[PDB]
Amino acid sequence: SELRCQCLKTLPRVDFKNIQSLSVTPPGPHCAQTEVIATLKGGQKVCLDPEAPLVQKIIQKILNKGK
Amino acid sequence: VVASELRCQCLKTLPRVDFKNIQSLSVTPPGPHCAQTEVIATLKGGQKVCLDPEAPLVQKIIQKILNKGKA
Questions:
Q1: Residue B35 touches chain A, beta carbons under 8 Å
Q2: Which CATH code, of 2.60.120.510, 3.40.30.10, 3.30.200.20, 2.40.50.40, is assigned to A1-67?
């Protein structure tokens, strides 16, 4: 068996409020790149650019969102 | 319907983990079912553990992952 990178394209942002969850996968046997996949509240799955400052900012706003 | 949308998935959080142990992370912001953001790290060998999302070392780990491919 062989898996590969599942992102064809990476996007520069999504709206914070629309994120249901994100998965962040570092490089490994499957893929040389970190992949960040946002699942949005309508079911969409989107690949985000993990190096984009807005994407890192969104991630941070999520990590910090808890009360 | 499903358990993960009806309650938090975490029974407790850790302050850090060896980052090279991490195979992947899922990050879920709070919602009706859960007051906290949850960061579930699946470690090599398959165990899922939660990381405290406001631990500085855990935010630093996630930044390192995001920045792996920059020069």
A1: yes
A2: 2.40.50.40
